[PDB]
Amino acid sequence: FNKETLALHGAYNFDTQRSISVPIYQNTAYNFENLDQAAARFNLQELGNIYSRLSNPTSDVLGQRLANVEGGAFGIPVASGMAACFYALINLASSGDNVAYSNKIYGGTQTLISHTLKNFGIEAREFDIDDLDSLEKVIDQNTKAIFFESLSNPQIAIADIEKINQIAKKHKIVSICDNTVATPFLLQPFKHGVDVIVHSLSKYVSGQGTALGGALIERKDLNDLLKNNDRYKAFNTPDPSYHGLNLNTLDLPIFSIRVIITWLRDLGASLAPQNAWLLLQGLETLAVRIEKHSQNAEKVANFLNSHPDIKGVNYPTLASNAYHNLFKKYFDKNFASGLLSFEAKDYEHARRICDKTQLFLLAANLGDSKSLIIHPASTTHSQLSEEELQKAGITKATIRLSIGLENSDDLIADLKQAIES
Amino acid sequence: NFNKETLALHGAYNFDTQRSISVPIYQNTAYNFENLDQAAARFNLQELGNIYSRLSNPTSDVLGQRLANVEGGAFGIPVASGMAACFYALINLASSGDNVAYSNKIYGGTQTLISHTLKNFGIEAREFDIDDLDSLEKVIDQNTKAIFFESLSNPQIAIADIEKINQIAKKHKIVSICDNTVATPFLLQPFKHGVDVIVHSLSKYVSGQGTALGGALIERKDLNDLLKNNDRYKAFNTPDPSYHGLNLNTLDLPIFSIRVIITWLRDLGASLAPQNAWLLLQGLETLAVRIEKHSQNAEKVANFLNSHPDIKGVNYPTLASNAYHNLFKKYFDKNFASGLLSFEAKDYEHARRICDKTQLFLLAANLGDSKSLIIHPASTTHSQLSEEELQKAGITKATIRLSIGLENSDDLIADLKQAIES
Amino acid sequence: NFNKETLALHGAYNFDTQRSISVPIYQNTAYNFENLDQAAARFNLQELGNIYSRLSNPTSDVLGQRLANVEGGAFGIPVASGMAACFYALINLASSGDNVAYSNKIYGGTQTLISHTLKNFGIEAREFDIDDLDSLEKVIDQNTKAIFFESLSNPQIAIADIEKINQIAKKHKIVSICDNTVATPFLLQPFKHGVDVIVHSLSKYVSGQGTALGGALIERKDLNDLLKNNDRYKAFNTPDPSYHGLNLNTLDLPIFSIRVIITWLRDLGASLAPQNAWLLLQGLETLAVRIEKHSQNAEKVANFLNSHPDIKGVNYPTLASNAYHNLFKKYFDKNFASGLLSFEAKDYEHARRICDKTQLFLLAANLGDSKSLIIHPAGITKATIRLSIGLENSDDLIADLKQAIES
Amino acid sequence: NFNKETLALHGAYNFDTQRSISVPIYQNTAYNFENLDQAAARFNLQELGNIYSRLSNPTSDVLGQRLANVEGGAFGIPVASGMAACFYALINLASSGDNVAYSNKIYGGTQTLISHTLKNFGIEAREFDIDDLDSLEKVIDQNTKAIFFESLSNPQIAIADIEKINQIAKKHKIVSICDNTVATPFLLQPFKHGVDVIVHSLSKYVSGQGTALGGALIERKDLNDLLKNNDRYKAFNTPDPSYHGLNLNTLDLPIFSIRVIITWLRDLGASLAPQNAWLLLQGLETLAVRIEKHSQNAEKVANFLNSHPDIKGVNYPTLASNAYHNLFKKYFDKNFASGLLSFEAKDYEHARRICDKTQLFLLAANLGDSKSLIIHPITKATIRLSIGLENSDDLIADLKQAIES
């Protein structure tokens, strides 16, 4: 079946009640049928329900469907997109190791990687997605992951995935792609050799600014890269937390297994059932929604691009954009999602715009059905240094927009009056 | 002003425009800033307020403050789970190269987190015996950033002599962390005895119905006094690059909680969902009445087990022969000891028949549910522990742990009776 | 088998495939029939089962059966609200041209429903005094299809002498309906005293937290005996065209509840949403412990008000001087009288100051919330104040009322 | 001002103190009045505002007003279900001894409600043929209080010639009620054609995912003009004892909606729960994009069925040979006909094999779910499909294998 169909059917066979909609398991524990069954589950001998901090049936449906839509093998939902980025990195790197990360990513993920992970003895090494030789340069035998975004936030920078893959495969390093903005419907990183995909479900999957959540998805056959690979000992050595169990002995997606038995179990960034359920509902309609977000974004982009009071527009469909060729190369449906940014005349103009819009809501989020607006320098990328901003391509006049599902003429009119004030 | 029961029902909520008596469920991730200054000001910690739900949410804020109010603390922060709360409390104090001291009698999951999982982040764990505090002095050095223990342990039901832990902790200027999950704030108030930070698995008694996973970190009043200008905690006294040189010791705010928000929630994201937060608020409202029934039932079940010939030992603090009975009388003002207890069956085979025979006690892995629960720890909750660590925590192959629910005690006793006698 | 407290926690739920201890929330409207026969069979009442949530939902089914179990009845049906429950109970018995007898001491909304709104449907209402039952005999005729009253009235806190109502009802072969909302199934069991149908506003004590609007209709065991072959109830003994001639008296099922489903829920649609049903199930689990606190607190507040010089009269059954005290001792086995009470202030102006001065008692229109509530509502006067006693600390409550009263 | 798509996303919501972009879920039954006067004033209809959730709730209020906004109406009231909405609309107009005129081509449940269940309340029902409007003139008398029909019928997919119904209704000064559930406010706007009251089963397309049962009654702008001083509707022109003699014709408010609240919701209690209302609001936000996919998919499935040799007849308005095609072109401005359609199998046994063989079309009784559905309700060979949001090729393939074997 096609992706649209897989977001609606699969990973749910109807329990006894045969409800068409997936039930909401607002529950933490399960009744084991007998003591053997219980103990067997605690020993990984038998798979099954144990305790919601580890897994929940509502969230399991979500995980598998997300994996199905991406063309991957297994997916794991967590409390948030950040938790997903965090879990993906620590599942690969531990104290004394380093990770390579793109210089054009979400501000929060940047802070997590370049500052917060130090506390755990994990070194971060920045690289430029626009000049991949810079990636080869920071790689050593201690580099455990290569992290980047498919379509960056807020520069809307597109990564040349095939080239990142080449380098990653060569050194036998796990590649992590945050495909949040593009969504699995506009881009399928797995098709291009990506090992692990992370998503902030909180954005487009929800599509309505109502459910915070994240997911870690692994490709098919990822064990091939982790098993018997000197770069990843955690997956090839007896583990004392599990009475000597060695993950390379399992015929299961070991990356996902470790996320469950270790990170969810001990760190506990668990996705609540109600959020999981809402996210499932959003997943069902994402295919239709992302197209509208895209169509609207393009019109807004064309309008901003021709207006005299605007000094520059950042959106991949624009033929003059630096990522336009990469866009045509990797986006099969010719839709570029709903995020875009533009340059106002100056700081004072950017501020007047944010204070004058009536439909674009001044807020810090993206992928909501309602259009949103923000000024990154003093907000989302407020933590970054004055120079890091320039490396990511942001200025004091920069405005970021999250294009919603409203009528395009109404949106254009709202931006027009704000801009012209 | 008011009593605890009252504070679990009123407070930290003004009634918005609609004046709904119940706290609204903010199933929402973002907020509409009134203007650009306001926004930027919030991102700079100049003005406090709503920004994004991964950091804070109004539904969960009411929960945090009320939990703090019932404990007699200053500020509280709900997180996705009890484990997340334990994790966040430790990392907010220790970083790579440091060590933490922890009780040998705690929740299995927390034990794994501390003794194994934290190694991955370069955080050393040093076990100590709550029954012999000299063992605590012994493992302390200038790199020790936290002293962790449970007020009423899971599953031994071991009571910590809080005042003595406090003495040692205050002497070395170390932050003490107490997991008060089982006792609940209604049976015991660790802050009264010098505890600095309290963690709770809200998932257990606060929920009281096995429906909402959640955790909370609560800090005492004046905790800044201990963190500010203390060489043992540089993260709270040095310009932070993640925040353009901001130095937390400069703030007139609960800095422990602030760091949890601006750093751990913001970057690690173990955020508590709004629906769970709301359900937990509801549970908090009734915890005072519920915990008393749980306690009354537990005591009757304990007395019954204690007199039955097929039972070899019972662990519950109300029993006069119990080793923690004096500590119980010393720290528990309402003479209720909560709903968790454990007992020894004749042997492994007997413990297993019991688990397979009960009809009301549900074989499951959780505690504090309104429905009674049962489990065999060695092969389950403490399955990860070594054969010797089990003995240091006091668990055997014949050990059974029970979570006493709100059902009728005669019905519960009868269910255990038939299971035990077969 | 088990006690009430236990039945509110175990029963009517056997764990699906996932074996979740908590009942799942079926936020769902339709079900996947396994095959066409199964489907058609369900639409014909040949096979019982899931069809569409407007009729029934598994989450709400657990609630219905447990409520029935705690009351000692046979089957229960949850609906959108207590009002809907009262409405559905009456219309399931009376149709245009019939009449219903109702107590003069009941919930205002129910009084309006019965004495005014039902006229629109050609249903006559005939009031009777619960304190003088001869008045009931008087209004009864062969067209009287129901006798409605409250076990513990709102806001009078008037207790009905159930046995005597039952006698009269059983004699004439008329279905008796008891609204047991305030007393709750834990303080009083109307079925023990001959009641046929029990209605509850689940919105009040079952929820116990002012969060879920809901109602329920519960029928006693063997109610068919009274409905089948009874000339007073032709709807249950005549082929029905809406169901291809089906005659309910032919069914080995609780026909009263069946009609509520296949007709009133199906066509009028006052369905109880799954989130509400689930919350109500949660509340049901803890009602036994909660109602005792509500009761203990109410009694202390009552005693305090009863001794304060600025208060002119207190209405609560535990007070030995109260007119319903003997009826209280006769029907309430635990010695708890719930959390509703009323009292007389010095006068209208005093009653207002009180409502405007309380800090814990919240000025609002509801009852049975965990938070204490207050309001200024024929059995009532301009000085009358009604209180809904919450779960707060009694000393705190008393202190809040003391400062309001003394201002 | 704005377009419909925009109105489904913005409006009727202020941002309370917290300024949450999403509408909060008021899982609550009561409200804290600020003082005694305020309270009493609300119980007397002097001041509008929150009282008790059985009557109104802020979450559901946003839904009501937005639904009204998208339809181009004045006020909307959500209720527990579509049936409850139909019921409430009728009884708000007719009482014992009156009669109502209803279309012979409507939802089965509504047909039962009107032709059988309402008898219990002394309300007579008189059927009429939407395809032959003279039949409507015929059943009308001075006791006829409502004219009920569907814009796009279920399961016939029969389109009503609204203008002609309106003509007749306006002439006799009778309130017209249009169930616009299947078409949705995005494909058809009955108010544009003189309809007085619109009912919707929100449970279907507005939810769009089979998760929230709900209904709504929406009234047009200026409906008072038709109700006030109209001898046909005394309930809206006589002192009411339930409200201490209050006479509704004295109010500067949508009196039709007011009565639904102060009388039907208050006393009958078919209240819409907050969680359902909130979910429905979420569905409303995305209905515009969803209904187009449902429509595009339906059309393709219809064309496929229409050309397959094992299929004997297809019922969908976009098909040029369909009897309602001209009416479709006349009333549907976008050229989308929603996701409901029906077709004739070879015979009863074939219709049954199909229902038992589909893997994507789920054998169930509902419509407007994002997942495609199928059922056997008109003839013995008739099959009714609810076209979902799945990929059309996948849907066509599933039906192809079922039909062919």
Can you give a write-up of this model?
The structure is a homotetramer. By secondary structure, chain A is α/β, with parallel strands linked by helices. Chain A folds into two domains: 284 residues, Aspartate Aminotransferase, domain 2; 137 residues, Aspartate Aminotransferase, domain 1 (Alpha-Beta Complex), CATH 3.90.1150. Chain A has a seven-stranded mixed sheet, sandwiched between helices. In chain A, strands 8-9-12-11-10 form a five-stranded mixed sheet. In chain A, helix 12 crosses helix 14. The longest helix of chain A is centred in the C-terminal third of the chain and has 34 residues. Chain A is globular. At the B-D interface, loops of B face loops of D.
Gist of the model:
Chain A is α/β, with parallel strands linked by helices and 421 residues long.
Instruction: Give the number of helices of chain A.
Output: 14
End-to-end separation of chain A: 50 Å
Query: What is the CA-atom radius of gyration of chain A, in angstroms?
Result: 22 Å
What string gives the helices and strands of chain A in order? HHHEHEHEHEHEEEHHHEHEHEEHEH
Could you give the order of strands across the largest sheet of chain A?
1-7-6-5-4-2-3
Helix content of chain A: 25-40%
Q: Which shape of chain A, going by the Cα principal axes? A: globular
Name the assembly state: homotetramer
Structural class call of chain A reads alpha/beta
CATH superfamily of the largest domain in chain A: Type I PLP-dependent aspartate aminotransferase-like (Major domain)
Largest interface (C-beta under 8 Å): A-B, 79 and 77 residues
Assigned CATH class of the largest domain in chain A:
Alpha Beta
- Number of strand segments of chain A: 12
CATH architecture of the largest domain in chain A: 3-Layer(aba) Sandwich
Taking the sheet with the most strands of chain A, its summary is: 7 strands, mixed
